[PDB]
């Protein structure tokens, strides 16, 4: 059956109950429709848990309340917990989920203790498809996948976070992919101020194919090792256009000492990247979250194996010219990275790669003085 949630038509009226009742009524194998030209006001967490092989067609605007007191410390704006079989999609392409994040960014700018929710938070479950829609101005992370979710596909998404003030949209990661298997991200555009895609602990079998990121911190493994032994494996990223990003791609691990654990990264390929005014084409950080003196006494021991960086082109920014990559592998770790078709230059035309603890078969000429 097909259900259309009743739109209250006013931002002071929360539409969430109407939406979850529609999902409860039709979500066992049915369809829920937000019609083209509609606006729904979501003034609380939208929990999609009653979905079981359901199809949620978003053709209108779902506008979340900014209500910073309400959202304070909350996990998710849209919560997708242990759902098996979901399609959350715009079939017209007109659907927009607006996180209304401005107030959160401004509050966080003045008070770093302010804790913000993730816009689309998937944990556990299986066979989830998210497609065709725009995500606008999330308070914090756009999309997260964890809890052992399997078979999750994000396709044809337009994601943008733009501040109307001088305070940037901090920590607006496009995709934080944690404990999961068989996640695919394809044909997505991201404009944000943090990681485009971050591979978090226990991510496995992730494919990212054709992505554009502007203003991001790159396609980034980690951070790993903060307080446990963390692994990322079997990752394939191809066709990334990285514009004005701090790095196009990289790996970040904590050093040893304290409560830090060991990081394992195996079989990760970054292929066919276009670098357009990004600060580094590639970066390895092995002293993440600590300083140089700390890392001298507490060396990094990350185990990186079968890391492939292939077919990178373009031009970095002025910032680190002549350096186009900073490969600071840990002193006690394995730095199993191979680079080929690396055609990236700084604006000057130079192409220096800083290295520490890199292997003899790296594939590009190294210069000493890597750090981070
Ligand atoms: C290295 O990682 C890649 C990327 O995940 C693996 O290739 C995937 O394997 C899974 C499971 O068989 C398939 O569902 C996908 O189709 C594959 N993805 C791609 C992009 O090819 C690959 O098997 C891993 N290699 C090793 C030796 O472990
Ligand atoms: C990237 O940065 C340059 C230099 O600041 C700027 O002129 C350009 O508009 C930015 N590009 C995008 C797509 O925002
Ligand atoms: C609820 O109403 C909308 C708009 O009329 C339909 O598109 C949908 O199928 C359901 O009947």
Domain residue limits at 145? 1-372
Check if 260 is active-site.
Answer: no
Give, in order, the Cα–Cα distances in Å from 61 to each of 113, 169, 177, 198, 327.
30, 21, 26, 27, 44
- Gap between the Cα atoms of 191 and 158, Å rounded: 9
User: Does ligand 1 lie within 6 Å of residue 238's CB atom?
Assistant: no
The total domain count for the chain is 1
SS (H, E, C) the chain: CEECCCCCCCCCCCCHHHHHHHHHHHCECCEEEECCCCEEEECCCEECCCCECEEEEECCEEEECCCHHHHCCCCEEEEEECCEEEEEECCCCCCEEECCCHHHHHHHHHCCCCCCCEEEEEECCEEEEEECCEEECCCCCCEEEECCEEEEEEEEEEEECCCCCCCCCCCCCCEEECCEEEEEEEEEEEECCCCCEEECCCEEEEEEEEEEEECCCCEEEEEECCCCCEEEEEEEEEEEEEECCCEEEEEEECCCCCCCCCEEEEEEEEEEEEEEEECEEEEEECCCCCCHHHHHHCCCCCEEEEEEEEEEEEEECCCCCCEEEEEECCCCCEEEEEEEEEEEECCCCCCEEEEECCCCCCCCCCEECCCC
Which experiment gave this structure? X-ray
* Bond before 223 cis per omega within 30 degrees: yes
Identify the CA nearest to 305 among candidates 226, 259, 361.
Answer: 361
Give, in order, the Cα–Cα distances in Å from 342 to each of 63, 323, 338.
43, 13, 10
Residue pointed to by tokens 């098996």: 84
Is the separation of the CB atoms in 37 and 54 below 8 Å?
Answer: no
Is the separation of the CB atoms in 52 and 28 below 8 Å?
Answer: yes
Q: What is the CATH number of the domain that holds 333?
A: 2.160.20.10
β-strands 61-64, 96-98: how paired? parallel
Is the separation of the CB atoms in 224 and 302 below 8 Å?
Answer: yes
- Gap between the Cα atoms of 318 and 260, Å rounded: 34
Listed resolution, Å: 1.8
Give, in order, the Cα–Cα distances in Å from 11 to each of 7, 258, 334.
10, 48, 54
SS (H, E, C) 147-204: CCEEEEEEEEEEEECCCCCCCCCCCCCCEEECCEEEEEEEEEEEECCCCCEEECCCEE
Tokens of 9: 């038509």
Q: Ligand 3 site: residues with CB under 6 angstroms?
A: 2, 4, 33, 35
User: Does ligand 2 lie within 6 Å of residue 244's CB atom?
Assistant: yes
- Gap between the Cα atoms of 13 and 138, Å rounded: 21
CA of 228 to the centre of ligand 1 (A): 26
Give, in order, the Cα–Cα distances in Å from 263 to each of 107, 130, 148, 178, 254.
33, 30, 19, 14, 8
CB count, 10 Å around CB of 220?
Answer: 26
* 123 DSSP β-pair partners: 81, 146
- Gap between the Cα atoms of 338 and 306, Å rounded: 8
CA of 90 to the centre of ligand 3 (A): 14
Q: Whose CA is nearest to atom 11 of ligand 2?
A: 244
- Gap between the Cα atoms of 68 and 125, Å rounded: 29
Catalytic residue among 194, 230, 279, 321: 194
Instruction: Give me the count of residues in the chain.
Output: 372
Q: Whose CA is nearest to atom 27 of ligand 1?
A: 267
Q: Whose CA is nearest to atom 2 of ligand 3?
A: 4
* 232 DSSP β-pair partners: 203, 265
Burial, 2: exposed, middle or buried (Cβ in 10 Å; 0-12, 13-18, 19+)? Answer: exposed
Give, in order, the Cα–Cα distances in Å from 253 to each of 224, 285, 347, 350.
5, 6, 29, 28
């Amino acid at each position: 059956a097909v259900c259309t949630p009743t739109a209250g038509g006013d931002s002071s009226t929360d539409d969430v109950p109407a939406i979850t009742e529609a999902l409860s009524s039709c979500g066992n194998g049915g369809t829920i429709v937000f019609p083209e030209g509609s606006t729904y006001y979501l003034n609380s967490v939208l929990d999609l848990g009653s979905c079981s092989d359901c199809d949620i067609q978003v053709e209108g605007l779902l506008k979340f309340a900014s209500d910073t007191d309400y959202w304070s410390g909350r996990t998710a704006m849209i919560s997708v917990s242990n759902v098996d079989g979901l399609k959350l999609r715009s079939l017209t392409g007109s659907g927009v989920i607006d996180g209304n994040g401005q107030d959160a960014w401004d509050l966080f700018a003045s008070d770093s203790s302010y804790s913000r929710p993730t816009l689309l938070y998937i944990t556990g479950g299986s066979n989830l498809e998210i497609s065709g829609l725009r995500q606008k101005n999330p308070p914090n992370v756009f999309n997260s996948v964890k809890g052992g979710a399997t078979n999750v596909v994000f396709s044809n998404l337009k994601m943008d976070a733009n501040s109307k003030s001088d305070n940037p949209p901090k920590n607006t990661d496009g995709f934080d992919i944690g404990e999961s298997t068989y996640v695919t991200i394809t044909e997505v555009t991201v404009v944000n101020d943090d990681d485009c895609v971050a591979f978090k602990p226990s991510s496995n079998y992730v494919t990212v194919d054709t992505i554009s990121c502007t203003g991001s911190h790159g396609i980034s493994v980690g951070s790993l090792g903060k307080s446990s032994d963390d692994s990322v494996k079997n990752i394939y990223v191809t066709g990334a256009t990285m514009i004005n990003s701090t790095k196009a791609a990289g790996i970040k691990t904590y050093p040893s000492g304290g409560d830090h654990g060991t990081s394992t990264v195996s079989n990760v390929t970054f292929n066919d990247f276009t670098v357009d005014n990004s600060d580094y084409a590639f970066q390895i950080q092995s002293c993440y979250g600590e300083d140089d003196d700390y890392c001298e006494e507490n060396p990094g021991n990350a185990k990186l194996t079968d890391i492939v960086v292939s077919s990178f082109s373009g031009t970095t920014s002025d910032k680190y010219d002549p350096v186009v990559a900073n490969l600071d592998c840990g002193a006690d770790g394995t730095c199993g990275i191979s680079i080929s078709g690396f055609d990236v230059k700084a604006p000057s035309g130079k192409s220096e790669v800083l290295c520490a603890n890199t292997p003899s078969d790296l594939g590009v000429t190294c210069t000493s003085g890597a750090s981070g």
